[PDB]
Design a protein around this nucleic acid. Structure first.
Lengths: 65, 88, 100, 271, 65, 116
RNA sequence: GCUUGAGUCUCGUAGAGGGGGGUAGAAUUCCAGGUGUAGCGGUGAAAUGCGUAGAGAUCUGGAGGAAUACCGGUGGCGAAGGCGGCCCCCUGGACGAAGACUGACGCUCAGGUGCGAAAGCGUGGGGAGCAAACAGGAUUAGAUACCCUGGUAGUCCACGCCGUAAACGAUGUCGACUUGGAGGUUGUGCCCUUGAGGCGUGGCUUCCGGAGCUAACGCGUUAAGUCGACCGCCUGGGGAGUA
RNA sequence: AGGAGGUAAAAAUGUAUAA
């Protein structure tokens, strides 16, 4: 039960770039729910959150640009 | 969709009581507002086959109620459709 | 009467000219009874990947409430303007405060 | 509307007629109408210079305003009329100060809309403004060539010019054919796209629809006698010469573009 | 991806790339659209995963080992 | 000539050979060598030993430029992918950092189907 | 007449459900320019092809089109076909809570009507990559195939038409009943949310198994068990789902 | 224990009578 957001329940915002930093790999990929053990609701929640932050250049798409 | 404000208006016009939101009178009137509201949607897209099914399904339900309503309250029946304008 | 969360970038130069920019936008919304809620100017923040040039950028956060007519026209003013880059517009979900 | 005419007679079998019910019926606006005597393809010398033109129903040239030399004065589009001179449709437009002039009808134009021309005009299909206040990458028609000349590019039915880029003093655009021409930035243009896009599907049908429009019959090379054209002759349908024009020039394969004073402008040729 | 490990590294020391993609996507995207074989092979893959779980629960037998 | 100090050794290692290219800090090429260019084409061309030798053939031919520090940027799912950089350690260079720039298409063009 | 069938309303929740319009990045290809030099590309081994006209490699800039890594999961949604970047606008269905209301309005359905992957067809655009046809080089007794370099229609969009597939859980739809276990997903209630819980109550869904059944394999509360309503369909193979 | 990379040219046919 290695959750984070499941206890601190909230509609996950893309703005928390510090929070989202922990969920992405150094390359820039989205770490799967199999590793973090995050609840599936919050996983898909996180996915849209990341991609919106990705769109606003708050998170890199990859290492080299 | 049938926004909430418009919904309470229709109920308070056909229902025998303010809370009487289950009468056959009301359900036919209710769906009819919705179907007229969807004609604009199916005047632009004309290719959206899935909600086309949505509309088609609710037409048959309207059809079944009038079938029912006729066989039970003949007088009431003619009154209803002249107030809602349909059948042809 | 939806709630929107407009977020848009600004090319540095015009960053010098940013307050008047928002002043025009908040006027049109208020012009149609749109209650504004946040106005968090993130300020000149460094990007992650370069947007065609510009290794630096300037953000503006809105979180405004408005009717659908106004918001569609106001979005077009981002399109045809060569200062605003990447304009995001999301949906309601009970408009917030303090957000950062 | 693209209607297939019902086959009543052999001759009307293939008439796919373009009917547009919005078109104003009646007589067009008198003050902007001057005569156009045809010439059947004959110059000052009276000889036939360009073949195939002759006959045809009597047309009446209408003064279509292309220059669009009005700035900051609104206009209310009155109605859409028919015009034999071209493929497009002209629109009778009325300015706020009581003045009527014609303009090409953009496809997003309905009877009673609001347009205006000038530098301060908003981006909306039907407006006319210089190519410095247009967003790089839009759809434009009626492009000019020199500042204040009038407009000579993409004014045919359903035609539009893409503005690819903008390199300071020059605006690199792209004509419909495929060439990417580089024109002066200060040249006026008109946003949108020219309407009546169904003109493509308008198939004549019987010879008349071609004949009463002005096109005379074309006589093939292998039918004429050897004294009249480089092809033909023979005891019976014998071609064999390299396909040429009636004046000994290699056709079907020879580049003939030669000005040189405009190559400075042509960026990429049609392919 | 990237590695510097500043001063004392002296060796390749980068097998972490195996831990990202490095070959797993290249040997996967080198050819074969399939369009629907992964559907087939993922149903086959997770079938084999449950074969292990079945076998894990089926390990409680003597065998004298 | 030109006397350059930095150097970025792009190493394109595919399933057939390891074309190695030492460029400058900006991108201008400064000499190269391949598996086949070393002199041995065929099955041998696609071997880790090929990339080994490839580095030596490119260890020289850059002596006019006297490069000191490197930024190796390997590229490709080749069999020589890993052996080539160790050949550069012994070659007398200093690898500052190693980078991987393999083109990983985000569902780009459909790949071929050339195998059965 | 009545309400347990069926249906409507109030507040919420999840979702690649559908249509329309925008937009971002990564990658292939092409074009323009710089650096730079003999191979590159390819295979089991080769050759055709590309390349001293200067490729491949690399970098800067630009043009385009199609697809949207990772999330991604026997995970979700739709009646089925199917549907996955992100954003907006329009819109359908499901599910739950606690109440209110109608009062059998229900189930199935020959003919009929609508939807229906991919291929194909007509008209008009688009065309990167991929790729039937086809060409060339190999392998081969021969190779009109597999393999290789190229390459068109098509794959894409808009509007019409086609109505077939192993359109498959090879299981028609609907309702009732008959021991369990491990999960996933999505709700909700109660208690101390004192702490990732504890105990329940619904939908959807995966797997393993008892009775029972089946020719056996297997199915097994989302049945192929025990029963009911209705419809479709079969009567040896080949001929033939053809004349 | 849990996941990834790499490994395989060519080679056709056997009629017609036994429990």
């Amino acid at each position: 039960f290695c959750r984070f957001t499941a206890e601190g329940v909230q509609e996950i915002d893309y703005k928390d770039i510090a929070t989202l930093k922990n969920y992405i790999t150094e390359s820039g990929k989205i770490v799967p729910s199999r590793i973090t053990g995050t609840r599936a609701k919050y996983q898909r929640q996180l996915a849209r959150a990341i991609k919106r932050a990705r769109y606003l250049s708050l998170l890199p798409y990859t290492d080299r640009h | 969709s049938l926004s909430t404000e418009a919904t309470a208006k229709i109920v308070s016009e056909f229902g025998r009581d303010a809370n009487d939101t289950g009468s056959t009178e009301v359900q036919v009137a209710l769906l009819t507002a919705q179907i007229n509201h969807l004609q604009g949607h199916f005047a632009e897209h004309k290719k959206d086959h899935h909600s086309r099914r949505g509309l088609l399904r609710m037409v048959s339900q309207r059809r079944k109620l009038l079938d029912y309503l006729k066989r039970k309250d003949v007088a009431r029946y003619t009154q209803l459709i002249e107030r809602l304008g349909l059948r042809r | 009467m939806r709630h929107y969360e407009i977020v848009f970038m600004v090319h540095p130069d015009q960053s010098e000219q940013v307050p008047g920019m928002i002043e025009r936008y908040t006027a049109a919304i208020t012009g149609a009874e749109g209650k504004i809620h946040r106005l968090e100017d993130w300020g000149r923040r460094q990007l992650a990947y370069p947007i065609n040039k510009l290794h630096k950028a300037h953000y503006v956060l809105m979180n405004v409430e408005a009717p659908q007519e106004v918001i569609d026209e106001l979005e077009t003013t981002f399109r045809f303007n060569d200062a605003v880059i990447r304009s995001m517009v999301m949906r309601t979900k009970h408009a917030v405060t303090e957000a950062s | 509307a693209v209607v297939k005419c019902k086959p009543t007679s052999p001759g009307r079998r293939h008439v796919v007629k373009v009917v547009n019910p919005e078109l104003h019926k009646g007589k067009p606006f008198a003050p902007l109408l001057e005569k156009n005597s045809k010439s059947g393809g004959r110059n000052n010398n009276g000889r036939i210079t360009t073949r195939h033109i002759g006959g045809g129903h009597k047309q009446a040239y209408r003064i279509v305003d292309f220059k669009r030399n009005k700035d900051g004065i609104p206009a209310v589009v009155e109605r859409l009329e028919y015009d034999p001179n071209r493929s497009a449709n002209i629109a009778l437009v009325l300015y706020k100060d009581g003045e009527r002039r014609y303009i090409l009808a953009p496809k997003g134009l309905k009877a009673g809309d609001q347009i205006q021309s000038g530098v301060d005009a908003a981006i909306k299909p039907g407006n006319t403004l210089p190519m410095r206040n247009i967003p790089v990458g839009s759809t434009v028609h009626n492009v000019e060539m020199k500042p204040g000349k009038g407009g000579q590019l993409a004014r045919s039915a359903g035609t539009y010019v893409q503005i690819v880029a903008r390199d300071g003093a020059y605006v690199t655009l792209r004509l419909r054919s495929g060439e990417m021409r580089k024109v002066e930035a200060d040249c006026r243009a008109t946003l949108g796209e020219v309407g009546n896009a169904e003109h493509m599907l308008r198939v004549l049908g019987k010879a008349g629809a071609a004949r009463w429009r002005g096109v005379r019959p074309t006589v093939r090379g292998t039918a004429m006698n050897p004294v009249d054209h480089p092809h033909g002759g023979g005891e019976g349908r014998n071609f064999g010469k390299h396909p040429v024009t009636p004046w000994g020039v290699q056709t079907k394969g020879k580049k003939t573009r030669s000005n040189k004073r405009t190559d400075k402008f042509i960026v990429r040729r049609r392919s | 991806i990237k590695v510097r490990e500043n001063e004392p590294f002296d060796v390749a020391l980068r097998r972490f790339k195996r831990s990202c993609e490095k070959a797993g996507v290249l040997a996967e995207v080198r050819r074969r659209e399939f369009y629907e074989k992964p559907t087939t092979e993922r149903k086959r893959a997770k079938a084999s995963a449950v074969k292990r779980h079945a076998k894990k629960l089926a390990r409680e037998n003597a065998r004298r080992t | 000539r030109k006397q350059v100090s930095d150097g970025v050794a792009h190493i394109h290692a595919s399933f057939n050979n390891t074309i190695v290219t030492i460029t400058d800090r900006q991108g201008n090429a400064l000499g190269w060598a391949t598996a086949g260019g070393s002199g041995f084409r065929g099955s041998r061309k696609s071997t880790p030993f090929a990339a080994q030798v490839a580095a030596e053939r490119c260890a020289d031919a850059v002596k006019e430029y006297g490069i000191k520090n490197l930024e190796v940027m390997v590229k490709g799912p080749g069999p020589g992918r890993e052996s080539t950089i160790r050949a550069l350690n012994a070659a007398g260079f200093r690898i500052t950092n190693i980078t991987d720039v393999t083109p990983i298409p985000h569902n780009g063009c459909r790949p071929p189907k050339k195998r059965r």
